[PDB]
Amino acid sequence: PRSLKKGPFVDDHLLKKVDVQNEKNTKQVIKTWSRRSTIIPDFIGHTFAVHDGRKHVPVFVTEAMVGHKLGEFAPTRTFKGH
Amino acid sequence: GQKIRIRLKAYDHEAIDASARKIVETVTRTGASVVGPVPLPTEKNVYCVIRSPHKYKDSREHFEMRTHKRLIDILDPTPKTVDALMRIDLPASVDVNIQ
Amino acid sequence: GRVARFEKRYG
Amino acid sequence: PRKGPAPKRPLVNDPVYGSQLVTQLVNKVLLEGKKSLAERIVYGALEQAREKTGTDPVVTLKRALDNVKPALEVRSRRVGGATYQVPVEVRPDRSTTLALRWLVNFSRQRREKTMVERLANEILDASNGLGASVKRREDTHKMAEANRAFAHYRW
Amino acid sequence: GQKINPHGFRLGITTEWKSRWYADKQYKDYVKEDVAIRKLLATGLERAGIADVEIERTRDRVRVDIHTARPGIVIGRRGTEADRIRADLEKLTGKQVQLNILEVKNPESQAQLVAQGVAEQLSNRVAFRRAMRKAIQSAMRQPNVKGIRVQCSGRLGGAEMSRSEFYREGRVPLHTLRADIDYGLYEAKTTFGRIGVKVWIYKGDIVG
Amino acid sequence: PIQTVGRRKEAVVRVRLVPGTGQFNLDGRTLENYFPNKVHQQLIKAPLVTVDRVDQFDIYAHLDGGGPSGQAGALRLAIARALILVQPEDRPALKKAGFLTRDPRAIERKKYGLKKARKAPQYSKR
Amino acid sequence: AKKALVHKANKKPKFAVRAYTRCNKCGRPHSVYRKFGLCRICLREMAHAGELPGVQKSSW
Amino acid sequence: ARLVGVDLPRDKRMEIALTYIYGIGRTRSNEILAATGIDKNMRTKDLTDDQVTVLRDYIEGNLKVEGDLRREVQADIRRKIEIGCYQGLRHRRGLPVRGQRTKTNARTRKGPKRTI
RNA sequence: ACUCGUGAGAGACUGCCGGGGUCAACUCGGAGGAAGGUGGGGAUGACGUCAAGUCAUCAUGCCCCUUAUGUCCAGGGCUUCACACAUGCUACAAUGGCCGGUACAAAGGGCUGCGAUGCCGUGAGGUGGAGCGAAUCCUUUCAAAGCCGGUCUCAGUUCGGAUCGGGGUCUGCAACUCGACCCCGUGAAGUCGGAGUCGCUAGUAAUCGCAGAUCAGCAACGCUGCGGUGAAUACGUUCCCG
RNA sequence: AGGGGAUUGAAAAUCCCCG
RNA sequence: UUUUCU
Ligand SMILES: [Mg+2]
Ligand SMILES: [Mg+2]
Ligand SMILES: [Mg+2]
Ligand SMILES: [Mg+2]
Ligand SMILES: [Mg+2]
Ligand SMILES: [Mg+2]
Ligand SMILES: [Mg+2]
Ligand SMILES: [Mg+2]
Ligand SMILES: [Mg+2]
Ligand SMILES: [Mg+2]
Ligand SMILES: [Mg+2]
Ligand SMILES: [Mg+2]
Ligand SMILES: [Mg+2]
Ligand SMILES: [Mg+2]
Ligand SMILES: [Mg+2]
Ligand SMILES: [Mg+2]
Ligand SMILES: [Mg+2]
Ligand SMILES: [Mg+2]
Ligand SMILES: [Mg+2]
Ligand SMILES: [Mg+2]
Ligand SMILES: [Mg+2]
Ligand SMILES: [Mg+2]
Ligand SMILES: [Mg+2]
Ligand SMILES: [Mg+2]
Ligand SMILES: [Mg+2]
Ligand SMILES: [Mg+2]
Ligand SMILES: [Mg+2]
Ligand SMILES: [Mg+2]
Ligand SMILES: [Zn+2]
C-alpha cells in the first residue's frame, strides 16, 4: 500500500484526460499505458483501454473497483493450462 | 594550554615509522613536548571475491585492506614548531591531519 | 460502500 | 584410526557427588550442548531416586548400571557372501558406555511426563532389574549365545 | 586455473605497490583516473618498451613515472612526445602532472620487456622456438639472473590446435616467498589470433 | 601488590591476590552470584585445593570477554599463576595437575566452500 | 557491455532511482564494489598487479 | 461455560478459553479480560453467569465475532472475485494470491499432491 | 601498576635424559616448558589430464547484420505451473512453549551517511536533531542460547506457522502483474519420516545470536565472517569407496 | 506390463512407492 | 557366492 500521508497515486496524464472527458460530459475510451494509477471516484463511470503489454484491454470502471490500481483488471500472462 | 593533535594514517607500516621519526625529530628540535608515536588499532576492510568468471563459486579469494594509525600529541605549540610542522614534507603514503 | 471507504483514508 | 589408537579424554569429577560415572551420564544426556540443562536433569533424577528408594543415589546408579552392563556382544561380518553375526567379548569401558547410552535412550521413550522423572524411574527400575533397558542387555546376551558356533572366526 | 600471479603473492613482502597515495573519500575517483592513465599509456607508445607505470598523488600535484626500455622514443628531443603525453594527462585532469621517464638499466632482466621481445618476434613472422631460446640466453647472461622460465601458448605457427610450450633454465622457485621473482605477461597480436607469453625471471632472494 | 592474568578463548581476567580469608570478589559480586553453576565453582576452587592453601586468600577479579565458561577457565589459570607468585615451590604440584597450561584451544576460522569450520555442504553424485 | 549502456549509465537519469553502478574498467553491471568502483574480476586483476594502494592478499 | 454461541472448554485459563471464539485470539483476550476486570488466571469451572453476561456485553459491543465475521470475510472474497481483480482470478484458479512462488511450493493452496 | 592497542625481540630445534636402532636415519617413554616432536589454522596447487568451464568480464581470428541481428522509450516478461528433481530454512513439542526479573561476547559498519535523550504511537515508525569522517559519537551501556521465578499437563494442544481477510508504515516518479516490515484476526500440513543417502575425529559436531559486502528498498532462510555454550566415538583393516 | 523415486559414469538387473 | 552391456 502507498502510505496515506502521500495521498493516492494518479499520474497527471490520465488525470488531465479524464477531467477533460467528464467536464465535456463525454464518456470515451481513453488509451492508457499507465498500470500504476489507482482508481479515484472521478473515474467511476468511464472506460479505459489499458496496456497489458501485448495490446489494449477494455476496462469498465464501476463503484466496487475504487481503491485499486488499474492494471489489476487487465491480466498479463496467458495461462490456459496443460 | 594548547594541544595540537597530529594524526597519521597509512596503508604501509614502515612509512608510518618514517613519518613518526620525521615529525618527532622536527618537534624535539624546536623544543615542544611530544607525547610520541602512540599506536591505534588497525582498520581492516575485507572483500571476498570469486576467482573465475562464470561459475565455480566455491573457489574464492580474500583481499584485505589495512590502515595503520599513529597519534602524535604536541603540547605547548611553540610558534616556531608550528611553523615547522606546516612546512614538513611527508611521504605519499602518509596522511597528516593536523588538528 | 467502497468509495466511502476510499474517502475515509484519503478524502 | 588407520595409524593407531587415538588418545582418550580426561572426564572430570562431579562436584556434588564425586563419581565420574555421573558426569559421564550427563555427557550422554547432553543435547545440543547445553551442559547446564543436562546437569540439573541428572541431579534431579538422582534426587527423585533418593526420595523414592530412600537410599544413596550413586550406589543405586552403580547397581543399575551393572545389571544392564553386557559382557558379551554381537559384531556383524559378511563372510563368503553370507552375513554372520558374531559373538565378541567386550572390554570394560565399551560396556559402561553401552549400558549408559542404553539406559538414556530407553529413558527418552518413557511416558512419565518429564525427563527428570523418566530418567529417575528408569534408573530406579534398572536397579530392581525391571526396566526395558535390562531387557535389552538380556537381548544382546541371548543373541550372543545363540550364535556361539560362529565364534570360531574369532574375529 | 593454476598458479597465482607472482607479483600479487609477494606483494606485502618482497615487492611493492605500483602506485602510492592515500585518500578514503577520494578513493574511487583516483582509481578511475588510474585505469584511465594506464589505458592511455598502454595504447599510445608501444614503440619503446613500457616496463612500468608508477603513479603518485599529493593533493593537487600528480606524478607519473614511466619505466621504459629506451627513453629516446618516448621523448622527441624537441619534447614532442612529452607534449602529447602531458596533454593527455591534462585531458584526464589530475590537475598538475609531472611526467618523468626512467630507462630501466638491464633490458633483459626485466620480465615485462623480455616478454615484449619474444612477443614481437613471434608477432612478425619469427619461428617461435627461436624467439624463446634467444630471450633465454640473453636474460641468462646478465649477472643477477639466476633462472628464467618462458612459457608461450596459443596457435603457434598458426596451426589449428593450441600448443603450449615451455622452457626453463636454472632455478625458478615459485612457492618460495623469500624468492624475488619478476613476472611478465604479454599477448602478441598475430594473423591467426593472439598468443600469450609469460616470463618468470628469478633474481636472487630478498632477506629482511 | 600481586597481579596476574588468565586467558581462555577470548576471555581475560586479571586477578589480585590478598592475604585475608576465603572471600571471592568478581566484579562486585560473590563467587556464587557470578558463575552460579557447581561445575564452574569447582573449576575455580580447584587450584587452591591442589595446593591445600584453600581459604588463605581474599581474591579480587576483573573479568572481560568470553562467557561464563570461558571466564571460568581464564579465572582458574590466573589464580594458579598467582599461587606461583606467592610461594614458588608449589609449582611442581600445580603444574602436574595441569592448572598452569594455557588452553591452546580457540574457535576455528570458518572456511569458504564449507558451512562452518569443518562441516561441508551436502553432496550427491547423481 | 554494449557501449550504449556504458555511456547510458553515465548520463543523468530522470529519476534518482534509475542510477546504477557498472564498474569503471570493463563496465560490468553485476558485482561492483563501492569503494573501488571495480567489479570482482577487475579488482582481482589490479589487486594482483599492485595498482590498488593498500589492498593486498589476505590470510588469517 | 457458554459464550456468544461458543462452548468454552472444561478447564482453561480464560485467555486461552476465549480463543475458541472465531473472532478472538490471544491479544484480544488480554484486552477483553483486562477491560472486564475478570482475571485471566481463572478456570472455566469458576466462571459465573454474571461474568458471562458482562463478557457477552463487552465483546458483542466492541468486537465482531463468529458467524457475522465469517459471512463478512466470505463476502470480501466473493466481492474481489466478482469485480474480476487479479486476486479474484487467483481465488478462482485456487492458486496463491499474494504473489508467492507457484513453480514449486504453494501446496497449501493447491492441496495434496496429484502426480503426472 | 594491571589489561589492551601495535612495533621490535625471545621461544621448539628430537635441543636435554632413558630404551630400541647396522651406533645410521628414525621410533617408545621421561624432564623442563605457555607449547613436544610437521603445537592449531591459513595463504601457497608441480608435469599434465578432462577437446571440462567461459567468444556475456575482457581481448580476439574468421564468418554473419548495417536500414537492421545497431540504437532510444513506454508497457510486459525474466516471479508463469498438472508436475519431477536439488540445496536450504521452520517444524512435528515439556531438554518444550508463553509472561516477568537478570548475567556474560567477538568482530565489524558509517557523509548528502550512522543518527542519540526527549515527545507522538500498540507496533512497524513519525517529529527532531545531540554527537561523530569516528579505540572518542552512533550502531543503545551491545547480544541470544544461560540462570531465577510463575503458568501450561501430553492434547493436533497455550505445539506448528503455512494460507486467507481486514487495517497500516517505510523506501521510491511508481509497490497491480512483483517489495519488505508491523497490528488484528484466520490456524492448514505435520505424531521424527520407505528404498536409499550425507556431513563430521576437538573448541570439531550440534545448537545460539551478531556484523558485513551487493543495496533507495528488499525476495537474505543466501553468501562471507565473528564470537557464545559445547559432546559422543575410533576395538581396528576382513568388507564398500578413492 | 506401466508412471515416479533409488542404486549406476549412463543403461539393463535389482529395491521401494503408486493408479 | 551374485555383478549383463556401453
Ligand atoms: Mg561457532
Ligand atoms: Mg538500483
Ligand atoms: Mg550493482
Ligand atoms: Mg609448502
Ligand atoms: Mg596440479
Ligand atoms: Mg567442449
Ligand atoms: Mg567480447
Ligand atoms: Mg563478438
Ligand atoms: Mg555469448
Ligand atoms: Mg524497458
Ligand atoms: Mg520488467
Ligand atoms: Mg531466475
Ligand atoms: Mg534437476
Ligand atoms: Mg533457504
Ligand atoms: Mg534456528
Ligand atoms: Mg505458538
Ligand atoms: Mg517458536
Ligand atoms: Mg526473558
Ligand atoms: Mg579474533
Ligand atoms: Mg512509547
Ligand atoms: Mg539496559
Ligand atoms: Mg496455536
Ligand atoms: Mg493431520
Ligand atoms: Mg504430541
Ligand atoms: Mg529410516
Ligand atoms: Mg581429518
Ligand atoms: Mg541491503
Ligand atoms: Mg547388447
Ligand atoms: Zn570490470
- All three cell numbers of E184, joined, read 611478465
Element (H, E) at B29: helix B13-29
Element (H, E) at D75: strand D72-79
Neighbour count for residue F105 (Cβ, 10 Å) = 9
Residue G32 DSSP symbol: B
Q: What is the DSSP string of F2-37?
A: --EEEE-SSEEEEEEEESSSS-EEETTEETTTSS--
- Identify the experimental approach: cryo-EM
Element (H, E) at D60: helix D57-67
What is the domain range of residue A34? 1-82
- All three cell numbers of F3, joined, read 597481579
Residues in chain A with CB shorter than 8 Å from the CB of H77 are none
- All three cell numbers of H73, joined, read 470475510
Q: Domain limits of chain E?
A: 16-105, 106-208
E58: nearest Cα among B74, B88, B83, B20: B88
Report CA-CA distances (Å) from F9 to F15, F36, F76, F110, H90.
17, 20, 13, 16, 56
Would the CATH topology of H1-71 be identical to that of H72-116? no
Q: Is H81 exposed, middle or buried (0-12, 13-18, 19+ CB in 10 A)?
A: middle
Task: Compute the radius of gyration of chain B from its Cα atoms.
Answer: 19
What is the domain range of residue F86? 1-126
**A2, A9 Cβ separation under 8 angstroms:** yes
Residues in chain A with CB shorter than 8 Å from the CB of H87 are 72
Q: Is E64 exposed, middle or buried (0-12, 13-18, 19+ CB in 10 A)?
A: buried
Cα distance between residue E35 and residue F106, in whole Å: 43
**D121, D45 Cβ separation under 8 angstroms:** no
Q: D139: Cβ–Cβ under 8 A, 6 or more apart, which residues?
A: none
Cα distance between residue E20 and residue E61, in whole Å: 13
Place of cell 604501509: B12
- Number of folded domains that form chain B: 1
Task: Compute the radius of gyration of chain C from its Cα atoms.
Answer: 5
Q: What's the CA-to-centroid distance between H6 and ligand 10, angstroms?
A: 56
Tell me the pairing of strands H6-7 and H2-3. Answer: antiparallel
What is the CATH number assigned to the segment(s) H1-71?
1.10.8.50
Q: D131: Cβ–Cβ under 8 A, 6 or more apart, which residues?
A: D68, D106, D122, D125
> Chains meeting F at 3+ CB pairs closer than 8 A?
B, D
Residues in chain G with CB shorter than 8 Å from the CB of B60 are none
F78: nearest Cα among F26, F19, F21: F26
Nearest beta carbon to residue B61 from set G33, G44, G53: G44
**B95, B14 Cβ separation under 8 angstroms:** no
**E108, E139 Cβ separation under 8 angstroms:** yes
Q: Which CATH architecture has domain D20-153?
A: Orthogonal Bundle (1.10)
CATH of the domain at B46: 3.30.70.600
- All three cell numbers of D102, joined, read 542404553
For D36, nearest residue in chain F (alpha carbons)? F37
Q: Is D87 helix (H, G, I), strand (E, B) or coil?
A: strand
Neighbour count for residue G29 (Cβ, 10 Å) = 14
Cα distance between residue G17 and residue G4, in whole Å: 19
Residues in chain B with CB shorter than 8 Å from the CB of F112 are 48, 58, 60
Report CA-CA distances (Å) from E9 to A55, B12, E6, G47.
59, 17, 5, 10
Cα distance between residue E155 and residue E160, in whole Å: 6
CATH of the domain at F72: 3.30.230.10
Q: Is H87 exposed, middle or buried (0-12, 13-18, 19+ CB in 10 A)?
A: middle
- Asked if E20 lies within 8 A of B10 by C-beta distance, the reply is no
Q: What's the CA-to-centroid distance between G16 and ligand 2, angstroms?
A: 9
**D137, D68 Cβ separation under 8 angstroms:** yes
- All three cell numbers of E88, joined, read 593527455
- Number of folded domains that form chain A: 1
> What string of H, E and C letters represents the secondary structure of chain E?
CCCCCHHHHCCCCCCCCCEECCCCCCHHHHHHHHHHHHHHHHHHCCCCCEEEEEEEEECCEEEEEEEECCHHHCCCCCCHHHHHHHHHHHHCCCCCEEEEEEECCCCCCCHHHHHHHHHHHHHCCCCHHHHHHHHHHHHHHCCCEEEEEEEEEECCCCCCCCEEEEEEECCCCCCCCCEEEEEEEEEEECCCCEEEEEEEEEEEECCC
Taking the CA of G26 as reference, the closest ligand is 29
Residues in chain F with CB shorter than 8 Å from the CB of B58 are 112-113
Instruction: Say if domain E106-208 classifies as CATH 3.30.1140.32.
Output: yes
Cα distance between residue H55 and residue A75, in whole Å: 48
Q: What is the DSSP string of D105-143?
A: HHHTT--SSSHHHHHHHHHHHHHTT-SHHHHHHHHHHHH
Q: Domain limits of chain D?
A: 20-153
Sign (positive or negative) of CA dihedral A26, A29, A32, A38: positive
β-partners of residue H6 are H3
| Residue G39, annotated as binding a ligand | yes
CA F118 / C1′ I135 distance in Å: 33
- Asked if H82 lies within 8 A of A64 by C-beta distance, the reply is yes
Can you list the domains of chain G with their CATH numbers? 1-60 (4.10.830.10)
The answer to whether the C-beta of F33 is closer than 7 A to strand I is no
Query: Hey, what CATH topology would domain E16-105 get?
Result: GMP Synthetase; Chain A, domain 3 (3.30.300)
Chains H+B touching (3+ CB pairs under 8 Å): no
B38: nearest Cα among B75, B68, B2, B77: B68
Place of cell 589470433: E193
Alpha-carbon distance F114 to nearest alpha carbon in chain D (angstroms): 21
**D72, D85 Cβ separation under 8 angstroms:** no
Nearest beta carbon to residue A65 from set H83, H87, H89: H83
> Chains meeting H at 3+ CB pairs closer than 8 A?
A
Task: Compute the radius of gyration of chain E from its Cα atoms.
Answer: 18
E37: nearest Cα among E29, E26, E25: E29
For chain D, the straight-line distance linking the first and the last C-alpha, in angstroms and rounded, comes to 18
Place of cell 627513453: E71
> Which of C3, C7, C8 is the best residue to mutate to test the A interface, defined by the most A CB atoms within 10 Å of its own CB?
C3
Nucleotide whose C1' lies closest to the alpha carbon of residue D78: I239
Q: Domain limits of chain H?
A: 1-71, 72-116
B70: nearest Cα among B23, B3, B1, B27: B23
- H helices of chain H, in order, are 14-17, 26-36, 49-62, 66-82, 86-93, 107-110
Query: Hey, what CATH topology would domain H72-116 get?
Result: 30s ribosomal protein s13; domain 2 (4.10.910)
Q: What's the CA-to-centroid distance between G60 and ligand 19, angstroms?
A: 9
**D70, D140 Cβ separation under 8 angstroms:** yes
Tell me the pairing of strands F58-65 and F24-26. Answer: parallel
CA H97 / C1′ I163 distance in Å: 10
Q: Is F63 helix (H, G, I), strand (E, B) or coil?
A: strand
Alpha-carbon distance G16 to nearest alpha carbon in chain E (angstroms): 20
Nucleotide whose C1' lies closest to the alpha carbon of residue D80: K1
Chain F residues with a Cβ under 8 Å from any Cβ in chain B: 112-113
CB crowding E176-187: b at 16 or more within 10 Å, else e: eeebbbbbbbbe
Residue F118 DSSP symbol: T
Backbone angles phi, psi at A73, to 5 degrees: -100, -5
Question: For residues F13, F18, F20 and F22, what is the CA-based torsion angle, rounded to 10 degrees?
Answer: 20
**F70, F9 Cβ separation under 8 angstroms:** yes
